[PDB]
Structure formats: C-alpha cells, structure tokens
UniProtKB/Swiss-Prot annotation:
Residue numbers of Glycyl adenylate PTMs: G89
Gene this protein is translated from: samp1
Positions carrying 1-thioglycine: G89
Keyword Nucleotide-binding attached: yes
NCBIfam families: moaD_arch, SAMP1
Knockout mutant characteristics: Cells lacking this gene do not grow anaerobically with DMSO and do not show DMSO reductase activity, but their growth in the presence of oxygen and at 50 degrees Celsius is not affected. SAMP2 and SAMP3 cannot complement the samp1 mutation. tRNA thiolation is not affected.
Provenance organism: Haloferax volcanii (strain ATCC 29605 / DSM 3757 / JCM 8879 / NBRC 14742 / NCIMB 2012 / VKM B-1768 / DS2)
UniProt cross-references to InterPro entries, sorted A to Z: Beta-grasp_dom_sf, MoaD_arc-typ, MOCS2A, Mopterin_synth/thiamin_S_b, SAMP1_3, ThiS/MoaD-like
Protein name, UniProt field: Small archaeal modifier protein 1
A GO biological-process term: Mo-molybdopterin cofactor biosynthetic process
Record function comment: Functions as a protein modifier covalently attached to lysine residues of substrate proteins, as well as a sulfur carrier in molybdenum cofactor (MoCo) biosynthesis. The protein modification process is termed sampylation and involves the formation of an isopeptide bond between the SAMP1 C-terminal glycine carboxylate and the epsilon-amino group of lysine residues on target proteins. May serve as a proteolytic signal in the cell to target proteins for degradation by proteasomes.
C-alpha cells in the first residue's frame, strides 16, 4: 500500500522535502517503509542509519502518532514521521 513519511527539522532539510510518499508491499514493516524513504532520498542515509545499517537510537520514528518499532506492520494510508533530536542543550 501507499503511505507517507513526514520529515522535520534537520531531516526535512537534508531530504529537501517535508513529505514523501512511498509504495511498499502488503507485508511491509515500518523498517521496510523506512528503506523506501531512504531509497527515494539517499541524503537521509547517513542521518538515519549507523555504520551497522541500524536505525540510530536518537531518531524518533512514529506510525500514526505513536512510537513505532521497525518490526511493526504497516497499512495503506499510514502516516509515518521521522524526528531528529534537538541541537540545543
Ligand atoms: Mg551509511
Ligand atoms: Mg563499517
């Protein structure tokens, strides 16, 4: 199904977009949807994933308003969000 990522702060700046539509498999996880996002906007890759290819602990991923693990299922119509940590103390 199709779903959309909303990007904020530094991540929206790096991607050059505040909203990205992705179309993933019916059994796609949030992690699969995240890989689709990065494929569309590869500049995000260094900000989202560590050297090990794992999501950084300090990146906040939401699915429909709630904290989401990358293993969570998705559904057509989902609104996913990525928030970075703030730069200030
Ligand atoms: Mg990398
Ligand atoms: Mg390495």
């Amino acid at each position: 199904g199709s779903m959309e990522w909303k990007l904020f702060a530094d991540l929206a700046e790096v991607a050059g977009s505040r909203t990205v539509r992705v179309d993933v498999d019916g059994d796609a996880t949030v992690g699969d949807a995240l890989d689709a996002l990065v494929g569309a906007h590869p500049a995000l890759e260094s900000r989202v994933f560590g050297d090990d290819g794992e999501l950084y602990d300090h990146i906040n991923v939401l699915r429909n308003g709630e904290a989401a693990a990358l293993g969570e299922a998705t559904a057509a119509g989902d609104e996913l969000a990525l928030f970075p940590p703030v730069s200030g103390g």
